Design a binder for this molecule. Structure first.
Ligand SMILES: Cc1cc(C)nc(N2Cc3ccccc3C2=N)n1
Ligand SMILES: [Cl-]
Ligand SMILES: [Cl-]
Ligand SMILES: [Cl-]
Ligand SMILES: [Mg+2]
Ligand SMILES: [Mg+2]
Lengths: 142, 136
């Protein structure tokens, strides 16, 4: 998947498509919009291909990673979703939304202590009051 | 070959026994500790080809890249290592070091602050605070 592509690219250290600026930002923006058009219409398989394409070109982009993580969560591929949400958090250290979703994934993966840790981080550190309520509702059930 | 075509790791198919993999990891660390950086790099690349999802294998390769002053390449792997491990902030600490070397002090500060705020590793937090104390 996207993560193995990122690791392989790092192992090989060769020039990537991003290193040579193979696709301009404006075209990448257009493809992202097309990807979400597919998603919004229920064409989840095509949206997944487009998000995979974006994550091959520019893996270290929070917007691309979050879109793919959400698709995996919808598809109940909870470990892949959790791994990508964690990448998104590392890329965007001040948004606890991916931490909240990681917690949901961990609960579905039968890892309630990991889930609890995720939800507690939201409560302690997020300034999104609505996200905090949602995190607390999961904590109340754990 | 089937794993190449299906994206599965060599670890997934048990291509090398577990104890032999332990030995290879220990030999990689031995090269690293002895300053045999070229050999350590070969060995950590070998390990990461074998199991791209092994956090410690990735951390070894990232450390090599950081020692070699390939700071962006190190930071990229550290982000993966962090994500696969979920709750180990050591890769975030090293990313902060890389960002300082890349002349991105605001990014580094965010890394060290995240370590302070989330890590339960008191020795790691002490190191992170020492970097924060120095950031202008
Ligand atoms: C493609 C897709 C599909 C669905 C159901 N959600 C998303 N995303 C993207 C995103 C970015 C930042 C914060 C949250 C989210 C989020 N839920 N993306
Ligand atoms: Cl658990
Ligand atoms: Cl995990
Ligand atoms: Cl900066
Ligand atoms: Mg749009
Ligand atoms: Mg074992």
């Amino acid at each position: 998947g996207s993560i193995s592509t990122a690791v392989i690219d790092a192992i090989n250290s060769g020039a990537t498509l991003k290193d040579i600026n193979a696709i301009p930002d404006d075209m990448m923006d257009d493809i992202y919009s097309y990807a979400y058009d597919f998603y919004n219409k229920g064409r989840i398989e095509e949206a997944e291909v487009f998000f995979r394409f974006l994550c091959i070109y520019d893996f270290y982009n929070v917007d691309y990673i979050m879109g793919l993580a959400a698709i995996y969560q919808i598809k109940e591929q909870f470990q892949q979703a959790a791994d990508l949400y964690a990448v998104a958090f590392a890329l965007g250290k001040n948004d606890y939304t991916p931490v909240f979703h990681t917690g949901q994934c961990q609960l579905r993966l039968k890892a309630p202590l990991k889930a609890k840790e995720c939800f507690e981080l939201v409560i302690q550190h997020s300034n999104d009051e609505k996200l905090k309520i949602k995190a607390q509702s999961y904590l109340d059930a754990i």
